[PDB]
């Protein structure tokens, strides 16, 4: 049908826009004098995981459009299966880093960046590859994913649950800190507390509720599944690199510095 084609072009164009925005955000992160901190490095790694997801999706879509090589379809399917788990694990890493940073009385003595790299790019390798080998041995000509499989869902569900819990904890901390001081600025607590919720909804976005769904209404509601999971990279890049105040200030400083003139 026509709406099938609209959805098909829509998620691909969303993935392309997300990939472009993520590349721009990575360039901004890696090309300024105030280069990066641990938080910026974790954000850059999350951007890289999102780029991996987008590239895998684009390659598999192009191969499906062209052929319909099967080896390419397979190498892309396993690559995307690794990419989604890497993306979710890096969301978990961001959440855990934020949670552990607000529980410390003083600044951490070390960054522990190696631990975050080993739990972000290391867990998905241990999760998908041992079972990808099991799949190829059994059913090799699959190309089965179309954008059981519940075995790979366990790390996904665990990461979502942990992210939701730490998001609740961070919201509790924000409410406590807004109510404690600056209470004289009444009616402004909501306008600052709702901005944070829109600033960290990705750390705890629920997809299991949208996966445990069945009629024409269900088909209509399935629109968000290929929309939220397609513009997510663009939203993350906008929230973490383009709406950032100090990044904008540094960019303005760089632009003024370049525009010197000097007679």
């Amino acid at each position: 049908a026509k709406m099938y084609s609209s959805f098909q072009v829509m998620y691909t164009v969303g993935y392309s826009l997300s990939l472009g925005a993520l590349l721009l955000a990575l360039a901004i992160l890696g090309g300024l004098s105030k280069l990066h901190c641990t938080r910026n490095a974790i954000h850059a790694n999350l951007f890289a995981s999102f780029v991996l997801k987008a590239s895998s999706v684009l390659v598999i879509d192009g191969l499906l459009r062209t052929r319909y090589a099967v080896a390419g379809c397979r190498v892309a399917a396993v690559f995307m299966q690794y990419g989604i788990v890497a993306n979710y694990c890096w969301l978990l890493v961001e959440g855990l880093y934020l949670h552990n940073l607000l529980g410390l009385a003083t600044l951490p003595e070390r960054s522990f960046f190696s631990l975050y790299l080993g739990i972000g790019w290391g867990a998905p390798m241990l999760f998908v590859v041992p079972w990808a080998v099991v799949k190829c041995l059994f059913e090799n000509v699959q190309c089965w994913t179309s954008n059981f499989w519940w075995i790979l869902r366990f790390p996904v569900f665990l990461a979502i649950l942990i992210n939701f819990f730490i998001f609740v904890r961070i919201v509790q901390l924000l409410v406590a800190k807004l109510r404690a001081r600056q209470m004289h600025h009444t009616d402004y607590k909501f306008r600052l507390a709702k901005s944070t919720l829109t600033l960290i909804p990705l750390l705890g976005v629920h997809e299991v509720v949208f996966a445990f769904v069945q009629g024409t209404l269900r088909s209509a509601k399935l629109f968000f599944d290929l929309f939220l999971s397609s513009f997510q990279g663009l939203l993350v890049a906008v929230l973490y690199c383009f709406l950032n105040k100090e990044v904008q200030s540094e960019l303005r400083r760089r632009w003024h510095r370049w525009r010197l003139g000097k007679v």
Binding site: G118, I119, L126
Partner: peptide, 17 residues
């Protein structure tokens, strides 16, 4: 049929390091 390979909970990441 009983779950052939979905019953096996995936290996825990004992990150002792």
């Amino acid at each position: 049929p009983p779950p052939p390979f979905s019953n096996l909970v995936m290996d825990d990441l004992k990150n002792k390091k």
